Structures are given as structure tokens and as C-alpha cells.
Design a protein around this ligand. Sequence first.
Ligand SMILES: *C/C=C(C)/C=C/C=C(C)/C=C/C1=C(C)CCCC1(C)C
Ligand SMILES: *C/C=C(C)/C=C/C=C(C)/C=C/C1=C(C)CCCC1(C)C
Ligand SMILES: *C/C=C(C)/C=C/C=C(C)/C=C/C1=C(C)CCCC1(C)C
Lengths: 224, 224, 224
Amino acid sequence: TGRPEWIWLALGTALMGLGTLYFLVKGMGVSDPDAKKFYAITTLVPAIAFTMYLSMLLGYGLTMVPFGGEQNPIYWARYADWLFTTPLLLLDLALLVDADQGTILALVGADGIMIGTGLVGALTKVYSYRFVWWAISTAAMLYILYVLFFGFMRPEVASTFKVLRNVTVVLWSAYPVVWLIGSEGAGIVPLNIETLLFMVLDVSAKVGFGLILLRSRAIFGEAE
Amino acid sequence: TGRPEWIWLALGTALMGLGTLYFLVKGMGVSDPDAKKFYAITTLVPAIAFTMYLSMLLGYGLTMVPFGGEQNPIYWARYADWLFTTPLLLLDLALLVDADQGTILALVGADGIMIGTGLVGALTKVYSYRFVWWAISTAAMLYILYVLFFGFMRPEVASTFKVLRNVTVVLWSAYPVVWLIGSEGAGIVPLNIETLLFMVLDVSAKVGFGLILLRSRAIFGEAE
Amino acid sequence: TGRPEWIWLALGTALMGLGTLYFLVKGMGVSDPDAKKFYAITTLVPAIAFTMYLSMLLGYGLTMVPFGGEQNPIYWARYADWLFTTPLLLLDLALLVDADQGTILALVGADGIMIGTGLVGALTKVYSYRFVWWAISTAAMLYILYVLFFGFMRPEVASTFKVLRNVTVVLWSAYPVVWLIGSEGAGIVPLNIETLLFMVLDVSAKVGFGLILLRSRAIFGEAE
Ligand SMILES: *C/C=C(C)/C=C/C=C(C)/C=C/C1=C(C)CCCC1(C)C
Ligand SMILES: *C/C=C(C)/C=C/C=C(C)/C=C/C1=C(C)CCCC1(C)C
Ligand SMILES: *C/C=C(C)/C=C/C=C(C)/C=C/C1=C(C)CCCC1(C)C
């Protein structure tokens, strides 16, 4: 199309699609029940992202929100993606460490709150209030990060969890910043650059994260 | 009303309602925990369908989508039904065979993708792109069917699973065809006939499927 | 704002926010896995309510629905809250009594139906039909109440469950009445009083319920 961000949406669609196919093929033949869980979660994540990238590319997942006296292009489909994919990603971490159910519920619920309030902020027509939602969403993210560090095994489990926790902190923490400087927030970075940034983050957080996880012996039960 | 498809919506509402009441009464008194799971899942399915049929009958679950240069009546409430009822139905099959959690997640997630992309296709304003969504949704359905045949007990469990798997393949595979030839897709069959077809499919896939399942000794633990 | 109900929305936001913070601090340090489940569920409930109260206060969670020949202010965000918080509350009760999974699914599903049909009724443009949805929603509520009394331990578990079941029946049963007499239904009580009533009910059903639950020894495994 003639939205300059189309190229990043197209590459995102492609990389999510290819990552989905790769993980699908890779998990073919896996019989270990524990490993199956990780393959399922980890393949579902970019498959969902693929659909939502495509919806943005085709224009379905874009709406105009009036605020600051303009009609502002907001890609709402990102939140529909994140609503499902972010708890899934947290579930991969939580299963790695054999987290308590209470802890999993805390994580999933805080994540739901993070995404839902981010969506509310994204669609809010009173400019100043958009940042209230951003702050609440960010608080939920900080709670999530706190639990990953202070709320929790085989040495390979510890090692893989540590690496993935670090990837998670670094990549996830960038999202509120991009939103804040981008078209959803202060509008200091144009939508095409914002789209590029989220594409790099998303591909790393999904396909990159998944490559790290699915390469590890941590996803298998200890078997002779 | 004066929408000619009202009669099929009314009969669908009635048959789902009656099926719900029948399963409710039938599962009264069931104490076996395994059987309770099947009664719960299986009664919930037509209860949800009853609500969404009624919403279509009353006109709430209908919207107009512009495409191909017309205002096209799209019953969106079907997807709200299917979003919940189709994974529930898959859950009945998966519990019958004591499926791995990874496999259940794969099934539920692929199903979510099937329904969500079908909804996107149903609401998409660019005619040609509607069929892209249809294709992606169909791929998700084919993945689901593949898992039911290649991804998986007491002989009565095997026997009941086999029958229900066959019912599932035959009925579910008809949905993409009806959508394709109907008002959502190529518009070769009118909405009133499309509605009739989905009504027959839905009642069979829910109340018919449920009668088969709930009549079986497979839903009970092996007890003396 | 100049909506007279703003004061009740503001106090609701505050009390849910404070209740969230209190439960969060209170559950700090809890290591018992069973207790963690209850703290997680019970803190998530007012955290979600806090977000949805704030959304109503800020005006995001309000829409106008034409019916009875007027444009009627309907707070839809209540349903988005209840959709998540009501099954969570039922989950607290069900975990207390170690409910069968079938029973939990029945409860959660009936609750989903209660809330979804209440939302449909709230948004329905044909006045008389709003009450059809109300009736169906009420039937789902009555099913839920029936299960809590007829569908189900350590003496402290029994004692706490009994108290919380009674609180639940009394408070939950008031909701259909308020809706019926309020702006969503017959319009005999003005929106500002309706808002006050739901605020008192919600705070009691969430923060009050939670204080009772989290003060009990019932939420802990039996340990030496
Ligand atoms: C695969 C995609 C992922 C891992 C996306 C993660 C996204 C977030 C952590 C987003 C966080 C946000 C906030 C913390 C504040 C408001 C804006 C959001 C939703 C971008
Ligand atoms: C009770 C209702 C059920 C079992 C409905 C099943 C529906 C489907 C399998 C629908 C599939 C579709 C596609 C595969 C492609 C696009 C259109 C859909 C959603 C009708
Ligand atoms: C924390 C909030 C809670 C516990 C809310 C409970 C709400 C209900 C039990 C609402 C019930 C309703 C009906 C039974 C009929 C239609 C209207 C509703 C949704 C208010």
C-alpha cells in the first residue's frame, strides 16, 4: 500500500509466518509430553502474531482515533495479538520453572491488565488520559518483571530460564518506551519508525525467544 | 421477522434450547467426576449456541458489511458462538482420549485461530482479501483434523472416539464450503439457504454429537 | 465531571484501588501454594475492577444506546469487569471446597453466559427484548446459586465456605434487581442512584468478600 509502514508490516508478517512454519516442522515427532507443551505454546505465539501482522498489513487491524485534534491511525490489532501471545510467553517461562498455580494466575492476570489497559490507552480520545492508562499498564509490567525476578531446578532449566528472563526484561521493557514516543503517545517518532521498532521487538520476543527455548534440553523431562 | 432466514434461526434457537434442557436433566444426579466433565462441556455447548441463535433471531447478532459494492448482512454472532463452542467440542474429544496438555493447547489454539480468522474474513471490506482469511482459517481447520487423525485406551473409549472423530470431520469440513458459497464468500447461495445449512450443521455438531457422546459408557471412569 | 454519578465512580475507583494495594501487601511473603492461589485470585478481582471503574470515571466505558426513543447512557465497562471477576470469585469458592473440574466448568460457563447475556441485554435497541436477555441471564444466575447450594472438608473450610456462599447469594441476587429498576431496564431509578447501588454491591462483593476470605485459615493447606 501507500502507508509507508507497509514494508515493516509485510516483513513482520513474513518473519512470523516463517517462524511458525519452522517451529511446526521442528516439533514434528516430539513425543515427550513436557516438550510438547513448550512446542505448542511456542509455535502458537508466532502463528497468532502472523495473523495479526497480516491484519495490519491488509488494513483490517487499523482504526482512526481522534485526539489532540487530529485523526490518528492506531493499529489496534497489536493488542489482540498481545492479549494472547504475552501470557503464552509467560506460560513458557512459568512452566520451565514449575511455577505454582497461584504465581501463574498472578502473571497471566497482571499481563491481561497490562494489555487491556494499553488498549484502553490506545483508543482513548482525551489526550492526557492516554498517559494515565500507559502508567497503569506500565505498573502491571513492572509487577510482572518483579515476579520473574523475585517470585521463583535442574541446572539446564536454571540456565535457560535465566537467559530467557533476561531477553524478556530487555525486550518487554522497550515496548512502553516505543508506545510513549510513538503515534499512540507523544507522537515524537512517526508511525513508520514506530512500526519498525515494534516489528524488531516482536520478532525477537517471539521467534528469537522461541529459537532459544526450543534449542534447549530444558524443555524435556529428565529421561534415560 | 421479514428476513426470510428467520425460520431457520427460530428452529435453531428452539433445538439448541431443547437440547440444552435435555442434557441438563440427563446429567442430573451424575456423581462420577469424569462423567461430570463431559456433561458440563456437552451441556454448555448448546446453551451457548442457544444464546447466539436467539441473538441472530432478534437481530442483535447481525451487522451490515460493505463489500463488492453492496451492504451485506453478516451474522457475526455465529463467531462469538463458535469461539467458545468449538474448543469445548475439541475438549470433549481430547478428554475422551486422555490427550497430552500440549496437544490440547495445540488444538484449542489452532481452533481460536480458525474462528478468529474466519471472523476477520467475515468482516473484511476488501472482497478478494476475504478469501485470504478463509484460506488461513481453512489451514487451521486442516491442522485440527490432522491432529485428530495423527496426533493421538479402553475399547469403548476407542470406539466412541472413532465415531465422534468421524462425525467431527464430516460436519466441520462442510462449514468452510458453506461459507465459501454463501453470503460471506462468493454469494452463490442466498443467505436464507446458507442459514438453513449452518442450522443443520450446528444442531448435528452440537446436539447430535452430544447425544452420541453422552449415551456412551466411555464418559465414565472404570468402576466396579 | 458533570455526570452526577461521577462521585460514585470516583469512590469505587478509590476503594477498588485501595483494596488491591491492601491485598497485594497482605499476600507478600505467602509461601503456601494453596494460599497463593487464593491471594492471586482475590487480589486480581479488585485490580480488574479498579481499571474498569476508572474507565467509567474517565468516560471511556460509557456508550449511548438508543431505545425507548431516547439516547440512553449505558456503562458497558461493567460487563468487561464482571466477565473476568465473577468467574474468579466463583473460582475462590470452588477451590475452597475442592470442587470437581466438571463443576468448576459448569460454574464458569454459566457465569460467562450470565454476563454475556446481560451485556447483550444492556446494548439491545428493542426495549422489550432487553428483558428477554435479563431473564436468560437471571436463569443462569439461578443455576449458579443452585450449584453453590446443591452441587457440593476441614471444619474451617466448611465454615468459611458457608459464610462466603451466603454473602455471595445476598449480594449477587441484588444485581438483577438493580439492573431491572435502573437505567438499563425499566428506568425507575436514575443512573446516579443505580451507580451508587452497584458501587456498594461491587465493593462488598470484591473487597468485602476478599477480606473475609483472606482472614480465614481455610486458605492454607493443613500443615504442622
Ligand atoms: C510478542 C509481543 C510482546 C512480547 C509484546 C509485549 C508488549 C508489552 C510488554 C507492552 C507493554 C505496554 C506497556 C507496559 C504500557 C502501555 C503500552 C504497552 C501495551 C505497549
Ligand atoms: C457448533 C459449531 C461448530 C462445530 C462450527 C464449526 C465451524 C467451523 C469448522 C468453521 C470453519 C470455517 C473455516 C474452516 C474457514 C472460514 C470459515 C469458517 C469459520 C466457517
Ligand atoms: C464484582 C461484581 C459482581 C460479583 C457482579 C455480579 C453481577 C451479577 C450477578 C449480575 C447479574 C445480572 C443478571 C443476573 C441479570 C441481568 C443483569 C446482570 C448482569 C446485572
